[PDB]
Enzyme design. Sequence first.
Site: not given
Lengths: 738, 714
Positions: B4, B204, B214, B399, B401, B403, B577
């Site tokens: 089945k 992001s 300061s 950033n 990351c 890039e 990722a």
Amino acid sequence: MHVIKRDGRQERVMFDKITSRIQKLCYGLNMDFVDPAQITMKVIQGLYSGVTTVELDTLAAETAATLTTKHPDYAILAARIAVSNLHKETKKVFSDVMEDLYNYINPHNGKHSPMVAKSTLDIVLANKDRLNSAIIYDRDFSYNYFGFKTLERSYLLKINGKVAERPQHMLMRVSVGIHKEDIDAAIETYNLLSERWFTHASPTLFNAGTNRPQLSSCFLLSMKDDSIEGIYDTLKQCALISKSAGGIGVAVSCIRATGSYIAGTNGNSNGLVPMLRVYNNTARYVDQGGNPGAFAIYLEPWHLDIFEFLDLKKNTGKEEQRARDLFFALWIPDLFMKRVETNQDWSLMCPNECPGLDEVWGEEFEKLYASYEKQGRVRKVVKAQQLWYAIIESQTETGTPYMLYKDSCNRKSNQQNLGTIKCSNLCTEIVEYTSKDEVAVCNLASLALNMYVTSEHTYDFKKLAEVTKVVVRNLNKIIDINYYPVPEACLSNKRHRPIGIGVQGLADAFILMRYPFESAEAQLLNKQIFETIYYGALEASCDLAKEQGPYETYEGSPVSKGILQYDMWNVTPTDLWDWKVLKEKIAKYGIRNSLLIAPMPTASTAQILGNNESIEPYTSNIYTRRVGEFQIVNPHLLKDLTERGLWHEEMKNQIIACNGSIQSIPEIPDDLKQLYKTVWEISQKTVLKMAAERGAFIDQSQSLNIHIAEPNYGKLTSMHFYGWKQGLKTGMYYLRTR
Amino acid sequence: MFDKITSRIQKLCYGLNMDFVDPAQITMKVIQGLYSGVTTVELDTLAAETAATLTTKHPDYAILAARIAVSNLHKETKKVFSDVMEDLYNYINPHNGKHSPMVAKSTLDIVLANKDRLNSAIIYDRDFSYNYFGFKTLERSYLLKINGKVAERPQHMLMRVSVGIHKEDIDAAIETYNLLSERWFTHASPTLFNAGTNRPQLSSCFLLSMKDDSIEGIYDTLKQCALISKSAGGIGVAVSCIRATGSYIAGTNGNSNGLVPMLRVYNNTARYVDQGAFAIYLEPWHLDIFEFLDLKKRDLFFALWIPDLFMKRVETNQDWSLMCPNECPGLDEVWGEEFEKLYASYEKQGRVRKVVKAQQLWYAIIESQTETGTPYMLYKDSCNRKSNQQNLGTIKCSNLCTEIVEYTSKDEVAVCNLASLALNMYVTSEHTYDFKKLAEVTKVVVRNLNKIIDINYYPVPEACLSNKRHRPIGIGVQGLADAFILMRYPFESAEAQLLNKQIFETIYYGALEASCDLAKEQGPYETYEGSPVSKGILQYDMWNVTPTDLWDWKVLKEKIAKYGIRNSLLIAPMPTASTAQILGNNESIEPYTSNIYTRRVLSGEFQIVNPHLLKDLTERGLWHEEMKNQIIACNGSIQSIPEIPDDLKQLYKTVWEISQKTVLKMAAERGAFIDQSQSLNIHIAEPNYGKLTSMHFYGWKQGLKTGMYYLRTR
Ligand SMILES: CC(C)(NC(=O)CN1C(=O)c2ccccc2C1=O)C(=O)NCCCC[C@@H](N)C(=O)O
Ligand SMILES: Cc1cn([C@H]2C[C@H](O)[C@@H](COP(=O)(O)OP(=O)(O)OP(=O)(O)O)O2)c(=O)[nH]c1=O
Ligand SMILES: Cc1cn([C@H]2C[C@H](O)[C@@H](COP(=O)(O)OP(=O)(O)OP(=O)(O)O)O2)c(=O)[nH]c1=O
């Protein structure tokens, strides 16, 4: 022999020469076991074919200092030795010091650097004629050594490394920094600052009359919002304050407990445990730069994270997850105390699940809290005694958390109309209103309570009550001209105008009035001493309302509705003072000041003029300071040990092994044993007793420390519940053991 | 029954080359459920689970394992898009009771009107196009979840993303959908998350310059920082402007505690606010540079913003002056041949706080990299001389990351909203590359990303002012490794090198031709005038790389010279990722790190091998349970086992034995057609400082923007 003078020439170092160059200063010392002979000895007994004169009075001063144990006059003497070889090393007249301080140049950048201020100096030379001569430089021979080397260390501005002011030069600039344009009162302010009738607290001394004078100590912060935008605009707010060297009390009650829903970004909150380490590292980031700053966090026990708030100063714990430089405080509502002592359970809540829980107190809070309990809308339910010994478990471990009583701290404040006080200050004496656009500030000025005594041991009340008269107007003017590092601080204290008149050396005061600290005469004086200040404060704030108009938000206030601070305590006063005609006087005109009295703790600014450190009594009859590392016994005590000849080297060592407990050794009259009783020995029921008695005449609160070298749990339990039960706003500052 | 389930099983095994797939061994491992319990879905739960286990036998078991979970996702989700959107707005949080609209009225309202065409334009047999491990990265965060239960299908979320971006534009919505659904590309992770939602974040990237030295400026940068970490954004921070340790403080008469206690406030901030981590960019001339590479030896990732000098006085064995940006002001804010004159000033003026041999610094960085991996290497004077925002001023950081290379200021905290390309979808069943549509698809993505600029809910108004003028967009890529592998190229090969030239050319001129098109429509990004491309010279000219005869740039140069471009920066390969752990393409641009890897689905740990490797391995039969183990023993290497025809171990080699000399080679060869930088990872597991010294410099000698992202060892 061989010392090169002040010249560049040489002199035959002679014992006959030095012991007479010290005999020049010994005036005002009972000079019966005060003896300049045996200073010169150890000095000359190390005097080598070299060593200059100032660098010989480095020896001469620091030697008469170490030999203070022989008599408390040697400290006052060792001072004059260092002071006189500061006088011949400092510019002789005031306007010449000031002019020389503004034309100061930094040799690193070459950038012209105004130590003082153009906002000040130009009023200074303006009255150079009388101001300069209105300075009695014979009054920095009234300080003791250990105070003076608190003075020169950081209170006396130096140029390129060496001292530029004398203490009077510093005190007059302060009195010039406060009144600027005003002179008839500026010299008056000086004339009380100098002969130590009082003092302004730490920061009011440092940068009075510097460019952007920052004349305020501690500051108060309620969390702007339950928002990161509000949190970090709070975090910015306080980082700015510690820039300008400011103590801080923060109400973090407003913040989402750990595991509370976030709608905006669909996660659960992290709580305060992570949010507070942010403040932890903010603290030892921005010190002022060069010793560290620190903020007192005020979390209310209904908050879900209260247990983890308490694990935060356990000595050594869990690393990535724990904070140190922050000081912690409990902003406790009556209810918690109640059902700890009734041993009924207790609900822990999130200020978001249960909103507006921090902005409500007393009877109003009894039900709003119990309303959530009935709804079922709470996170943790725990037996109320849990949180209780867990607090004591934290305190017995450290000394923190502090213990303030919100529904006693709000019941008896003049700022009630503005709303709920959600927190107090760094040292838990200041109880002012705080909000999103408001961060009320501390205007602080210590009072040397020992000075208002006659050589006949009767108290000079009508002078204490008019010195305060001056203290209040100083702090008023300070409110306006003080630089506020944050716009809300200004537009708070500019509004409310709360000033905090503190006191110090009531340890000394009781002693020099010949009272044991516990006696039913001290007790009997403790009232009136604080009746006096408050009266002089209200009297002074009233004369100020009729001249400049009551502060923003005056009526609405308890006083505007006609019932005063002590009336909130139900403690009817004593009839020194005709309070009827004061109430009535306050009634046509009003007051300038939201809050007045705040017995704030003073350490440096107490070390400086030899009075013992806030309201607390003497802790150890024999104690120590380091600037070598010198032994110092209680002045007062040796004053009487010598008067009747019961002080020898075979006695000094005995008292040291007593922690000052001069009670064991029975060659000392019991008249003195009772009188100089170390605070440990004193069952502290009476201290908080006393606090409540005097607290009735304290607008805000009083920083009280608690000393029991042998702290049990119930013996700590029955301590707080005494203080809370009989009315205190601040139940306990630090816990001291050993 | 056994007979089945097996029926229930290849009722989904279509397209799965059924020789080294066998339905029974699935039904066999599930019968261990023993029945007498278990619902109708718990079956299918561990049944998918069981199939995903067997990716070891064929990468088709993974694709099957998807459908199982998927065909019983469609069972437990109603089948029409507009319905899904409806319940997603008529959501009520039942912990609470208040109305909580998970999508957007401003988008639902847009959905319901164009309802009837949208629901039918959604193909619902494209959820079967994903494979299991991709599907349960999707399940977790991307698919909006009404009361715990997944309310969306992959289609329902992707059409939501399409409609979220174009909003009223339906014709371009089904467009973006049909190539979002047919995996021709994908947007950034936060985009797929809040596209079409109430208050949408679609970015992001996010960069930040200290708006001062300061406190007032330190914490309005921090106030900004937490605010961005609130919106689930990773930040690169320019902290080069900050007082070194002990550098004399003004009116407080204090001396600064410098960098370390500061970054600790950011450390702790970066951990306090998740719904994350920040990158900190500190140029090697800052005095606190040694207190800097000891913090790594934590929640903060670290990075150096390196000028050409530092390298020029590391080769030549020459000294190096560590300065305070207060004694030596405007030092971070200047770049290139000019910067060296400003630096050599304070050199001669002598105001320098600590001078050490420059190579000592250098190895001190290698010491921190070998341990940790940080700091990220990005070459300052090599970023600004080849950046299109060169006109706006010196770019002071990248950033989180590495890039993104965009100008940041007092109130301009540049974003670089993102979208990657599925570079392996462009190939023929004739093994030639499809450049035509790669431009065409990239043509689309630019416009979507540019719609994204306009609609994006920006966390700080400073970020809005930066994106509205500059209008820059980071168009990244994925499956670089798989492209070569499906073009039957070795990664190191020369026709990998041809093609990789070309590959980023088509993307650059695809994106430039696209960015040129919405200067027509709306008018050039406001600070167009002044920029190097308003000055008629592009990215590949700054590298002076004569492009391939592939395209006619003389044509493109001359389109652009007319109307212009609504964008400053265009190309910027992400480390995609999760954003790529969905389609079936290897993570950013790096080669296959390890031919056999494993992803952890909750409790389970499934052995997943290179989908092309195994599917070529099995084609020969020369694959088994002994082959299997021998490859894991090599932590990836298939060079040991001599059975394998030596043509295939050229093709699937891992990045370990891929000589990095030649990874940075191709990196430069594509960086000329890359408007910004490149997240370049470096991989050596037995790293003498000699290897690191020589691999680093090969980068800045070859003029890279990013010298290094992560270091990777064992
Ligand atoms: C699950 C299955 C095989 N069996 C069952 O519902 C009930 N059952 C048995 O009496 C039994 C005896 C011995 C071994 C195993 C089982 C067992 O599983 C079934 O299809 N049973 C048919 C009844 C309807 C419910 C069912 N379709 C479902 O949704 O799981
Ligand atoms: C580490 C550290 C830095 N700082 C920095 C941040 C402060 O704004 C600054 C002192 O403030 P300012 O006195 O206003 O600084 P400045 O006038 O010398 O010029 P700039 O603001 O550009 O520095 O020093 C501290 O104040 N305290 C600290 O502990
Ligand atoms: C973003 C975030 C918020 N919080 C908590 C603490 C703050 O009190 C509060 C500020 O962030 P928000 O949750 O965004 O505050 P809010 O009023 O917008 O709440 P909501 O989004 O649900 O409507 O959230 C954290 O603890 N950690 C975090 O990472």
